[PDB]
């Protein structure tokens, strides 16, 4: 019943969070500057105490779907037009929301990015792009973004996905679903626990969703995982509280495993119907527990006039150390630079 | 006066991260611990542990900044915070057994250890160790002088990664010194890859070793039927050990997992047996010491270092060395299969 933990900020709590984000913007260049990220875990504890208490309850809730912090200050006039592409979305006016997303995120763990997503940016942008209407990436609009575990293919996938809504004039819903092990039966659960599935990287990790100047070798890891997926489970951990890892568009049973293929089909139908809506208004930030829920986004008509929906996105890990083989050096936060 | 610095050991330039508390920092930390002891039942009660990660951020800001640098330093051996307040008169005598060591007078030091530890991660304990207490006690016990346990004295505690056999082994081992009149040391060693043949290093990265559960996990006449399922898992890990690596992760910053008394090569892998004994001689030769005076707290990065303890002469007169001890995980969620419920912190309790 607390699977969605909703914190509505008081005026003072919103004001204090804004002032802390603005102090960070005054000190540091980028919301993912190395010097800022080294300090971020400590700066995050200058957020309001009552908010930190509720975030800490969310962090240790192993059945959390989403923490939702409502009512951060967003100055729509100062923010200016929604950029027409993520590459142009590192705007002066939006920096403060980047810094604030990292401060909230750093209460839950350490922020990471992907060498193969939005040019290795840690703070990324979710906005509609002309020509991506019908794609299965974050910049889509007309076609529903299919539910998925974020970076489901990767052993380094985030523990939390952070989404800070700057603008959402048409109240477009984020979609969310967890797995009730009781409502699929221990038969299917036992199959979903088996290493009997292939989970391929999604299209956001491909050269078609990154700058052309990026090195071909960044993508070798991704292409290997498309061509030759490892046999993996969808469920793991305790039977009473199993972790979920599946992507509606990029998951298959291994060849000739009709029982695995059947279990996958049951899961898709179970998650598809159970899929429920969370609307992030301007100033609302959600942390999805990526171990527990799949997420997507409802279809919407983008106006492409500078007024469109705009989220900042971040990946959070409970354990930065575990991915050191995949990072350039100790402090580097970009997965797949090694 | 507050100070902090990097103390090298061999070529490990940030081996030891030392923080010296100012008198005001020491007082702030003591007042926070005392306030926690007024508001919460125990240093490891559910009420306190649900809040511990937020309460830890009431510790002095300058100290939190230095602990945070330690937390993300993937070459750290030991974080040492020196100069916490200990009232020796009020503490009273060193108990004769851990079973008598969860004292009202020492609770405030349990609280403070959990507060420092919760800056680094989430505190955990072990079903088979001191009845699954999260805050444990390190003191010499009469009759254990010559054993390979924390309560030993006369015989060196031989060095190991803490709970080396276990995928749920801690990221940090924390120690809060209450008294140490004879300046008895914890022994510490990490691998310097530049002092070992690259071929030996390559072998240690292979899944070519068995790391068996140590004595603190093995069933005895008195280990109890309650942990029947744990001891079955332990028997499996003794009789049919998984093939595991000793080194893992990035070549530039490998994690170490080895136990000087419970590690062997896979049957017939003579090259692995050679690489293992080369590593044991290297770590044995690189061992150095951390001595914690009263109010000194250390966090050993269990991913990077083995640890043990020097031989010492216990008096068993109530004046002996006494530490509070804790285990810290960077990722509590990963061990849910081995814990009784979401908030429970005891590994092997279900
Ligand atoms: N649609 C789907 N089933 N999976 C891929 C979604 C890509 C999205 N996380 C992104 O843009 O990062």
Residue numbers in the entry:
A (entry chain A): 1 to 338
B (entry chain B): -11 to 338
Task: Give excerpts from the publication.
To assess whether we could control the substrate stereoselectivity of CmnC, we performed site-directed mutagenesis and created a CmnCL136Q,S138G,D249Y triple mutant, of which the three residues around the substrate binding pocket were mutated as the same with that on OrfP. The activity assay revealed that the triple mutant CmnCL136Q,S138G,D249Y almost abolished the hydroxylation activity with ∼3% relative activity to l-Arg; however, it showed ∼6% relative activity to d-Arg. The mass spectrometry analysis suggested that the compound 2 is hydroxylated d-Arg, of which the mass units increased by 16 a.m.u. compared to that of d-Arg. To illustrate the molecular detail of the engineered CmnC that switched the substrate stereoselectivity, we solved the crystal structures of CmnCL136Q,S138G,D249Y in complex with α-KG (CmnCtriple,α-kg) and d-Arg (CmnCtriple,d−Arg) at resolutions of 1.67 Å and 1.75 Å, respectively. The crystal structure of CmnCtriple,d−Arg revealed that the substrate d-Arg loses partial interactions and adopts a different orientation in the binding site compared to the substrate l-Arg in the wild-type CmnC. In contrast, the side chains of Gln136 and Tyr249 in the triple mutant CmnCL136Q,S138G,D249Y make close contact through π–electron interactions. In addition, the water molecule bound by Ser138 in the wild-type CmnC is lost in the triple mutant. Nevertheless, the relative activity of CmnCL136Q,S138G,D249Y for d-Arg hydroxylation is not as high as the wild-type CmnC for l-Arg hydroxylation, implicating that there are more residues participate in the substrate stereoselectivity. The structure-based enzyme engineering changes the substrate stereoselectivity of CmnC that accepts d-Arg for hydroxylation.
